[PDB]
Amino acid sequence: KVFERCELARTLKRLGMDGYRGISLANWMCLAKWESGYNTRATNYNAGDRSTDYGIFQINSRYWCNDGKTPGAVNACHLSCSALLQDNIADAVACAKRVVRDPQGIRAWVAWRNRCQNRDARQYVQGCGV
């Protein structure tokens, strides 16, 4: 499913992402925008290390979910990576929450540093009623 901006904004808020571990909703919106373009079926194979990024937040199979083919991987979210490709994003959200409970926080995603950190991210939630 490809979410519309405000549609996703409202959904994330209801799932309790606003301010989760100090991360504003606008930051989560910026992250999903640059990782998948708000697309839940997005997948990306990293030929360099044999891992795959799954779903709306492009969560990596080496640490967060199990896909069985990634060498020396763990499954910290205790989820099949398949769960991160559903239209309902409840599981992807529960896993993103797990990722940021680690010391790096939102910085775990390099794309966040390049495209979101120290920027005016208001634009991602403006006019959405959240």
Swiss-Prot record:
Keywords: Amyloid, Amyloidosis, Antimicrobial, Bacteriolytic enzyme, Disease variant, Disulfide bond, Glycosidase, Hydrolase, Secreted, Signal. It catalyses: Hydrolysis of (1->4)-beta-linkages between N-acetylmuramic acid and N-acetyl-D-glucosamine residues in a peptidoglycan and between N-acetyl-D-glucosamine residues in chitodextrins. Disulfide bonds join C6-C128, C30-C116, C65-C81, C77-C95. GO terms for biological process: antimicrobial humoral response; defense response to bacterium; defense response to Gram-negative bacterium; defense response to Gram-positive bacterium; inflammatory response; killing of cells of another organism. The active site is at E35, D53. It is an enzyme of class 3 (hydrolase). It is found in: Secreted. GO terms for cellular component: azurophil granule lumen; extracellular exosome; extracellular region; extracellular space; specific granule lumen; tertiary granule lumen. Its EC number is 3.2.1.17. Belongs to the glycosyl hydrolase 22 family. Monomer. Lysozymes have primarily a bacteriolytic function; those in tissues and body fluids are associated with the monocyte-macrophage system and enhance the activity of immunoagents. Lysozyme C is capable of both hydrolysis and transglycosylation; it also shows a slight esterase activity. It acts rapidly on both peptide-substituted and unsubstituted peptidoglycan, and slowly on chitin oligosaccharides. This is Lysozyme C. It comes from Homo sapiens. The lineage of its organism: Eukaryota, Metazoa, Chordata, Craniata, Vertebrata.
